[PDB]
């Protein structure tokens, strides 16, 4: 209980925050990382108005941590995004994420002859070479692609 | 007698400046009043020894607009013909003694200029063969240019796609470098880029161009678009889709083109032009495909017609 | 302005009692006084993208017996169209560029309805898409029992064969309860019934029908007997001629048939239909055949034409 | 201190879990104005809710008819000036276009440029949705399980 | 010697309870302590006139664990025997003087029994005739019962799916019968449900079966869970898709099953099993492909050795 | 255990250059004293999704020259696995409980190493998945550089013709840059180059490479000729044939090579290499071939078997 406000709404007690998600990628990230499967309180603020960038958007999970490496995998998405981990109140912890070296799950090979595309498998991808422009590399098979490329197909 | 009364319509190569516009004036007449008895009584082989029927369902439907019976075969998929040895001399030998025309697609290069050779004094008129050539999709493409900007002179033209082997880009920079101060620009994976023998023709005549690597670079200036399809194995599945599949229109990048602007493709579109492109209007690939008909019939009717009434 | 000018023919579900009455007296008029020349100038598409001949030569040769041309292709076994990933949509759009009305079969359900998403003015009529629909043969159907019976109402029309996936069957009941009166006898082995849709649209409607084991349980009431092919495949081997292969007639049975009783059977008849039962005045399958022509003429005459002379 | 809001639209109750498919389904995030979204909210007063509070955008008569399916007991409230102008609740439409995929493999709408469209009917017990393509009717649990 | 040396493997039917027991005895026994030149210069014949390549790799996998020789071939549009003119008849004849064993999998029924009669003192083992038999597979489905539940009388069995065509289910039903106090449910969709043939043989016998809608209902009760696969051309898309909200199994539906319950399927597992079951304990249809090896070696050493002392 | 034992074989780019020599060392050694007996009861499975014969029967030959037994299969156009439905995940779960290695060649890249997830303790050995790896064509050249040159770093490689595409250059790239001053020549034609990440890695280890035109430049300075076949699909007949005085080789061409001048092919060689050239000293392709023996008994013999002490 602290006086919310919807510009900057407040207070959660225990939970994660993710703050300074660029616009429109706040629901990317909430269906792509399956963040709503959860019986949890969310609140979610869309395109609200802040610290500079003007507009952001913003999710809050009670009870819920989601960490290290949780974190990075938002990392092509919300770079500089902030995860803020609350207890009784108080923000005991401010992660940033770092790119990763491995991307389960997200993303799609655009080699359409990679194996991944027809099974039981998870796509995975190697990350190369921080922000100049990062590369990905099929688990399978073994195509390097710019990651502007497999964001997209 | 018109000029090409009786003539063989083979190769974009041996069109003049003048022919190609009695052509082109003759389809605009026949687009405004129809003359669907013109050929009555001429019988018309369709010989498609490889299979097309964007192309053919198209010629025969205007030979029907004129009036002509048509009798042929599709092929590629077996329609006994060359059937023990048979050569293609002695095919045509036999289909010239009783249609008066013959149109035919082949998938060797230089097939339709040897019926010409064997079939006396019927026309022959070439639907394309292999990767050589296809004028009457120049024609309708031309046709095309003509009747949305007005002319074929002093066009700022881009060619988009797979250049090095879409036959169709090659024989309309050829036709269009017989008019006056068009002005080319070649966007093209590196991989499918514009062959040599077009580009120093090109520079041999004056003719201006340049290559460009994104549609947006030139948008600004242009007045066709004309598309071509990647054929995906030209590349491996990887290679079209790094970073060469952005060569591909959406509505969004036709922003700042000119009113006047046309996005022209021969079809099948599948990936390269998007869907919503459609509903705008610089979408014109469409009613050039209908186009096709009053070229197509123009040239079957100045064939075939010692003197043409209009 | 007839009420079918210029309409998409794509489902038996779109047409009135009044629609249907309507082409079925033109037929009657095209069978009694010819207009060979009535649709002189069109230029129709058949596309068969599933073969189907009988169907095929029913409507061309009467959009030939109109006056009409005819452009066209019977795929299946190859005929380049999809070739290279192009869209239904887009071909449509494409052949509706020059042709004035499309006949067209395709493997998919829906894919008609779709055509006329894409076809512009252009009239599409359906010759079948996979399971769903064919009222072209419904049409043809109505028009021979009304020819023999003298009316469309109060009859007793027995459906014997594979009910379950008979997609003709499934179409003439739900004209048929258009209409008064009719009473309904289904006679189907177990595994191919007629399924509920069918039976609980006629139950709602209070329209009256009956399961029954075998036609000498029916014969003496009954005006059309239609007979279904039971495909082999539906079965199994032993299931097929295990006691269900007796859903055969032969001209024994046909004994205690009232005189205006008519045996109809879209075709092929393989097994089904003894050929000892031809000899018969009750044998209608191939004059109902025949009546393909006049429906398929009368709507052809009524989609093109905005006023119909007779 | 939550979000009371100037105008807009406040769907209200819906049932848990629909919450996040009606944000995708119905494209509600792609607009510029401030959504505020509650999820597993508390509600002894109906279990448990999810609620979405969309401003100076106003959602109406069809756009709410099409909810009904997913979340049947919502209740949209419009607002102008601070309070509810409208309660309005979701009835069943009459077709129901764009979202939903017809069963049938064989159905053209797959592998084309169309636009689903099915027309529903109440046959106590269920809703059928009979697909416009096809015109093949199947039990809308069939079509929503997919 | 033993009860089956030299014996012919050709139905379930012809299996006493005994045999049925001796074999999945020696199966344990040769899984335990293997014995890998126990066919030391055995030639056996692996004839598939019907392609089925996982059948064909467990048998040859079989026959070389136990050091036997293989010839042989398989048959998807190819290899010249039983040619059309040349006859089964005169295939075996000629092929049983070359080897000691012959395993044949053949698509029309009773081919087995018919090369019985012309293989001489060749013992002929059927892989699958057609829609009539395939014992192998029954044997290894009871060997993986009896591994996992600890006897073959009193199992509460579901059988799930296409129970009026699979093969397998018909046969399990058959063998499992021999055994006593077994209680089968029956859960498939009224169009694919057990023939009557089956089932008054299981009343002749005083065993219970019950008929169930969905496995939800008695996955409770539940020992063997036997998914079969549902053969989507003995339907029609709309049929397929229409069933209740499925008879596929899902891991959310085994929440109640006991901690004994395994589910069964002879594969291939397109769609009636999701791979979230794979990682359940109850999943058993891999390991139950891994005892296909131990069931075929028993089959093969009693048949081929006179008497086993392993 | 060695280092290898129970290892899958997958890409080249996962064995260290330690791991590289410890394959070619034992190659030598089973080349020089052969042990026939080593697999005695292992069975090896081939499943060539894809029909390589060429690889499937040195595969095969391998596995019989160390006593092995084999089961599997190959499918230009026929039998059933992977179906369409069925999964290779499936496939390989069922057939990792019948045999104890599994050699794969499939035609979808990354094939084999999926397969790794499904095959338990079992090692899955590639032999070629889709234009992704070929590891033990690698070794085998390996082998054969180091067996007629006397080492595997300090040399002077040429590889020619279709470096873009050819599978088999990309990796013996990777693989001879593990080791020490290997100077690399790539004449090939600037349509089908040598990809830019084959040459950025090249240039991150120090590694010298220059591009050249024709073999007639690097001739003299040689110790490795690698030719490559040109896929004349991914070209233009007339491209194909425009190609200088060509990239072929002849003996006439050979007149100025070292002594031990080598000259390498993957095999098949239709055109690239003349006849004239089988007879020189230089010609190494078929001996090449009968290394692909030894390598790929090598492999099998560390991955099958704890420690070696041959
Ligand atoms: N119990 C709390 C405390 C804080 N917050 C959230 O924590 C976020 C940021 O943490 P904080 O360091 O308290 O504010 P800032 O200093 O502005 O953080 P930053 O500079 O990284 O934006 C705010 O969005 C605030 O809503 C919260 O929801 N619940
Ligand atoms: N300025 C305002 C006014 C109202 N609301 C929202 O509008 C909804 C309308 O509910 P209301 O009629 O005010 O009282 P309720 O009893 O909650 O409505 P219901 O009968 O559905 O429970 C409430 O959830 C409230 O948050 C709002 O966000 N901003
Ligand atoms: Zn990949
Ligand atoms: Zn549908």
Known sequence: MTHDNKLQVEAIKRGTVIDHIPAQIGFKLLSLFKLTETDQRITIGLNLPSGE????????????????????????????????????????????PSLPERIDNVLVCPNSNCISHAEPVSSSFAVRKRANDIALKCKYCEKEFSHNVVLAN | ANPLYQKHIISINDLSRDDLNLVLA????????????????????????????????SFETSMHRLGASVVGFSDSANTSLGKKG??????????????????????????????????????????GDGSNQHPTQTLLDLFTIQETQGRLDNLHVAMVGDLKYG?????????????????????????????????????????????????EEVMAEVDILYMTRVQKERLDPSEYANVKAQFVLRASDLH???????????????????????KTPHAWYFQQAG????????????????????
């Open chain 2, 167 to 215: 036959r169709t880009v090659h024989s309309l920079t050829q036709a269009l470098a017989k008019f006056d101060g068009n002005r080319f620009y070649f966007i093209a994976p590196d991989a499918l880029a514009m062959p040599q023998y077009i580009l120093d023709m090109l520079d041999e005549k004056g003719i201006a161009w340049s290559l460009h690597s994104s549609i």
């Open chain 2, 256 to 278: 700042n083109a000119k009113a006047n602007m046309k996005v022209l493709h021969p079809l099948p579109r599948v990936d390269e032009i998007a869907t919503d492109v459609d």
């Open chain 2, 291 to 310: 186009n096709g008909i009053f070229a197509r019939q123009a040239l079957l009717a100045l064939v075939l017609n010692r003197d043409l009434v209009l």
């Open chain 2, 86 to 127: 048979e050569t293609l001399a002695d095919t045509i030998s036999v289909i010239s003694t009783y249609v008066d025309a013959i149109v035919m697609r082949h998938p060797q290069e230089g097939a339709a200029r040897l019926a010409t050779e064997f079939s006396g004094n019927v026309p022959v008129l070439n639907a």
């Open chain 1, 53 to 96: 960038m003007g507009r952001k958007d913003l999710i809050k999970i009670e009870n819920t941590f989601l960490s290290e490496d949780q974190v990075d995998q938002l990392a092509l998405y919300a770079p500089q995004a902030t995860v803020n981990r609350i207890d009784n109140y108080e923000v005991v912890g401010k992660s940033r």
């Open chain 2, 26 to 57: 003759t389809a605009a007449k026949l687009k405004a009043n129809p003359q669907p008895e013109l050929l009555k009584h001429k019988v018309i082989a369709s010989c498609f020894f490889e299979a097309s029927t964007r192309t053919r369902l």
